[PDB]
RNA sequence: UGCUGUAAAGCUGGGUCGAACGGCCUCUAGUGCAGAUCUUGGUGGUAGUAGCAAAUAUUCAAAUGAGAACUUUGAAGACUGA
């Protein structure tokens, strides 16, 4: 890791928690919802039903919020926004906002390279 | 196209697009939908399916026309039957 050393990153659940019957009807979005029905086999946790979010799945506090390269990600919208990362260049990477213009985006990439700040999305227009 | 969060969700790459929009500290509410034989609008399967069968009945040729079972003219066969 080019970032500050960290323990090996463990994700307890890497799949997505999909709402029950979001596969069955178009009108049911996958955004997680808790079943509140009296008979619900999912709420009652029958064997064979879907995993549900609970606090036991929480990430280890020492590796939480880290991307695979070992950095926490900070959203940058202009050149000046890079400054708060100046003393945190081995633990915080910059991410350029989607709405920054192509002119200003080139300027942010240049300044980050000047300061030694990692950028997570360099290829943007 | 990926990243973050147990999650509600947040961010990002590519495309489309054309005029406004967001973070943070707070304020406020007509603030979150799968259901209500919910409301309005839109759209399927059914399905090229049911079906288009009462009132005797139509036919040949020419003309017209891009095109004629269905229009017009001629020939005829019929019917209403005062």
Provide the CA A97 to C1' B43 distance, Å, integer. Answer: 39
Residues at the strand B interface (Cβ < 7 Å):
A 9, 11-13, 16-17, 20-21, 24-25, 27-29, 31-33, 37, 53-55, 57-59, 63-68, 73, 75, 95-99, 120-121, 123-125
Q: Are A57 and A13 in contact (CB under 8 A)?
A: yes
Structure tokens at A80: 């000046």
Provide the CA A6 to C1' B78 distance, Å, integer. Answer: 106
A32: number of CA atoms within 13 Å, CB side?
Answer: 11
Q: Are A30 and A22 in contact (CB under 8 A)?
A: yes
Q: Are A62 and A7 in contact (CB under 8 A)?
A: yes
Question: Cα A90 vs. chain centroid, distance in angstroms?
Answer: 18
Provide the CA A55 to C1' B16 distance, Å, integer. Answer: 40
Question: Cα A43 vs. chain centroid, distance in angstroms?
Answer: 28
Burial of A6 (C-beta count, 10 Å sphere; 0-12/13-18/19+): middle
| String of DSSP letters for chain A | --SS--PPP--S--S--PPTTTTT-TTS-SS------SS-TTTTT-TTSPP---GGGPPPTTTTT--TTS-EEEEE-SGGGGGGGTT-TTTEEEEE-TTS-HHHHHHHHHHHHHHT--BS-TT--
Structure tokens at A119: 């950028």
Q: Which nucleotides of B are covered by protein (CB under 7 A)?
A: 3-9, 11-15, 34-35
Provide the CA A46 to C1' B54 distance, Å, integer. Answer: 66
Resolution of the model in angstroms: 2.2
Structure tokens at A6: 């960290």
Q: Are A94 and A76 in contact (CB under 8 A)?
A: yes
Q: Identify how the structure was determined.
A: cryo-EM
């Amino acid at each position: 890791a080019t970032s500050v050393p960290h323990p090996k990153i463990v994700k307890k659940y890497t799949k997505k928690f999909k709402r029950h019957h979001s596969d069955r009807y178009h009108r049911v979005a996958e955004n997680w919802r808790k079943q509140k029905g009296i008979d619900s086999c999912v709420r009652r946790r029958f064997r064979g039903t879907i995993p549900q979010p609970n606090i036991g799945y929480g990430s280890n506090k020492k590796t939480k919020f880290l991307n695979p390269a070992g950095y926490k990600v900070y959203l940058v919208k202009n050149v000046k926004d890079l400054d708060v990362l100046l003393l945190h260049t081995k633990s915080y990477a910059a991410e350029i906002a989607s709405s920054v213009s192509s002119r200003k985006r080139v300027e942010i990439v240049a300044k980050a390279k000047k300061l030694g700040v990692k950028v997570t999305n360099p290829k943007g227009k």
